[PDB]
């Protein structure tokens, strides 16, 4: 079984690293783990891919990962990425393709919320960011304080809403002090449906 | 092929019906659907299980479901439930086991938050419930209004936090009116780590 995955929104929209199409091969005969990857962009093979050694899983099977570094434009422009894997011990080569979705986009609304009053009794408080009404569910969310990106926050997976769109919450955990000191906290969101692909929302005490 | 499933959190934490470990058998030869189930609790067979007749699926294969009614304590206490199924037309008996995920419990803290000020311009608003610091990630969350459970809300999957515990948000969607009218909204949570396995938190305009 071969699974292919799209690039990360953060990466595709310059918000970070180099974008990559990832191809994962599971259920590999512990006997013949000599799997080979062949990547194509609209059926033209490329050799810039980087394949990783296989790893053992609980079920004594193996797993191999290959990453094709790509250009943000090729993806946004709808080109098809094809990863062809011939097990060498398999009857026939296995293929999987992928490209930017095609379904109708909807940018989300972004709201930031202060720590609930009751939590103020704690030594650590939560700064919440609500991101709702978006589609597709490919998105990127991070927290900043005084312009500096933060490490202590987590995003919930995009969740399906009653109206068909997705929503999610991002929680930044900070010491009570830090919130009271009045630093500026900014919720940053990257989505194709936003004007200029992103929106920032700030708040302070 | 066989699959085993844990009891429902609602049921395990008294919030409802009788808890049950479910064992599902798929890909059954339409020829020999005389499948037999054998249940064990720490390798001691029991006969309180209830097996259902097999059903046909699109792929002309069959599926059988067996349900072992259990006691809330046996599960919370970490006992192992084992379901052994010998197809009778299969080479060997197939087994699958299960037990409460692992380790030391931690009840969560529950906070409710009003709709963000900016959202008040909308015709529909969000009442938020933050549930953080819990483990294991087996939990149950629902919303009520004036004591009546509500349909229009959604829970995000439990998310892994930086400290090792899980957190999640539950969003109740209501018409602006409903929030302004001053009805009481209650966030109800069931977790083994809470005193009496649950906590409720209310709020209003
Ligand atoms: C032996 O062990 C192997 C590994 O052991 C571990 O497995 C994991 C899963 C867990 O059980 C551990 O306890 C084990 O130790 C087993 O390998 C697994 O095999 C299963 C197959 O049953 C694979 O499942 C597939 O998963 C993809 C999604 O993959 C992402 O999400 C996974 C869940 O969290 C995650 O584990 C993966 O790593 C992966 O994560 C992403 O990874 C990329 C890069 O790698 C990152 O960039 C992402 O950020 C990251 N995401 C994040 C964040 O987590 C899933 O899509 C597959 O489902 C599709 O196909 C099914 C076909 O069977 C179908 O039934 C589904 O409905 C679904 O179909 C799609 O549906 C959508 C809409 O719903 C349509 O739009 C699509 O068109 C449609 N596509 C089609 C045509 O299918 C599938 O469930 C699992 O990924 C793999 N583990 C990994 C990881 O490699 C092995 O199975 C086991 N063998 C035995 C003996 O059983
Ligand atoms: C012929 O048709 C059969 C039925 O037809 C229909 O099938 C469905 C699936 C759909 O395709 C329809 O269009 C078809 O008409 C096929 O039967 C199916 O066979 C597949 C096997 O490939 C079964 O898949 C397993 O699913 C479980 C999860 O089951 C729950 O969720 C399903 C998805 O929604 C749902 O369909 C099930 O009903 C079930 O729901 C739950 O049910 C219980 C009680 O029954 C309720 O209490 C719950 O509330 C309810 N949940 C809710 C809500 O939906 C999945 O866990 C299995 O994956 C594990 O094992 C894989 C091994 O192959 C492995 O690859 C996975 O990674 C995964 O492994 C686990 O991973 C986790 C972490 O990720 C680890 O922590 C675990 O340790 C690890 N466990 C291990 C060791 O594996 C698996 O995908 C499917 O359930 C079954 N359909 C039903 C239903 O019976 C049949 O396959 C087909 N045959 C042919 C010819 O292909």
Q: How many domains does chain A have?
A: 2
Separation between Cα atoms, residue B68 and residue A200, nearest integer Å: 51
Same domain, B76 and B130: no
CA A122 to chain centre: 32
Domain boundary among B99, B121, B154: B99
DSSP A196: G
Asked if residues A25 and A6 have their Cβ atoms less than 8 Å apart, the reply is no
Q: Indicate whether B106 and B193 sit together in one domain.
A: yes
In this structure, are B105 and B205 located in the same domain? yes
Scan for tokens 């033209």, then name that residue: A44
**Ligand 1 — pocket residues by CB below 6 A?**
A 1, 3, 5, 22, 24, 26-27, 57-59, 61, 63
Q: How far is CA A170 from CA A129, A142, B155, B168, in A?
A: 5, 8, 14, 10
Cα–Cα distance for residue pair B166/B162, rounded to 1 Å: 9
What's the rounded Cα separation, in Å, for the pair B168 and B161?
A: 10
- Residue A104: strand, helix, or coil: coil
* A143, A85: one domain: no
Distance CA A193, CA A107 (A): 4
Task: List CB contacts of A100: < 8 A, sequence separation 6 or more.
Answer: A6, A75, A76, A77, A78
* CA distance to partner chain A, nearest, from residue B50 (Å): 30
Residues B108 and B205 in one domain: yes
Q: Do A154 and B161 touch (CB under 8 A)?
A: yes
Give the residue from B44, B66, B99 where a domain finishes.
B99
Beta strands in A89-184, from DSSP E residues, in sequence order: 94-98, 109-113, 124-134, 140-145, 148-149, 153-155, 159-160, 166-175
Nearest to B157 by CA among A85, A137, A97: A137
Q: Are residues B56 and B5 in the same domain?
A: yes
Note down the domain range covering B106: 100-205
A134 & A86 share domain: no
Of the candidates B99, B114, B147, which is a domain's last residue?
A: B99
Task: Mark whether A113 and A199 lie in a shared domain.
Answer: yes
Same domain, A164 and A78: no
Resolution of the experimental model in angstroms, please? 2.7
Q: Which DSSP category does A25 fall into?
A: E
Most A CBs within 10 Å: which of B117, B121, B125, B130, as the mutation test of the A interface? B130
B110/B89 same-domain check: no
Cα(B69) to centroid(ligand 1), Å: 31
Identify how the structure was determined.
X-ray
Among the bound ligands, the one closest to the CA of A20: 1
Cis bond upstream, residue A37 (ω within 30) = no
Nearest ligand to the C-alpha atom of residue B23: 2
B92 with B155, same domain: the answer is: no
If asked whether residues A55 and A112 sit together in one domain, one would say no
User: Residue B90's domain is classified under what CATH number?
Assistant: 2.60.40.10
């Amino acid at each position: 079984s071969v699974f292919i995955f799209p690039p990360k929104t953060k990466d595709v929209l310059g918000g970070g690293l180099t974008p990559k199409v990832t191809c994962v091969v599971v259920d590999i005969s512990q006997n013949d783990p000599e799997v080979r990857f062949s990547w194509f962009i609209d059926d033209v093979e490329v050799h810039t891919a980087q394949t990783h050694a296989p790893e053992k899983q609980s079920n004594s099977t193996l797993r191999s990962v290959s990453e094709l570094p790509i250009v943000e434009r090729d993806w946004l422009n709808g080109k098809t990425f094809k990863c062809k894997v011939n097990s060498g011990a398999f009857p026939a080569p296995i293929e999987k393709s992928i490209s930017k979705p095609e379904g109708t986009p909807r940018g989300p609304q972004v709201y930031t919320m202060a720590p609930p009053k009751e939590e103020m009794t704690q030594s650590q408080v939560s700064i919440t960011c609500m991101v709702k009404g978006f589609y597709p569910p490919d998105i990127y969310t991070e927290w900043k304080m005084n312009g500096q990106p933060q490490e202590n926050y987590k995003n919930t997976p995009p969740t399906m809403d009653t109206d068909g769109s997705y929503f999610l919450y991002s929680k930044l955990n900070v010491k009570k002090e830090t919130w009271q000191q009045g630093n500026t906290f900014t919720c940053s969101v990257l989505h194709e449906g936003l004007e200029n692909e992103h929106t920032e929302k700030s708040l302070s005490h």
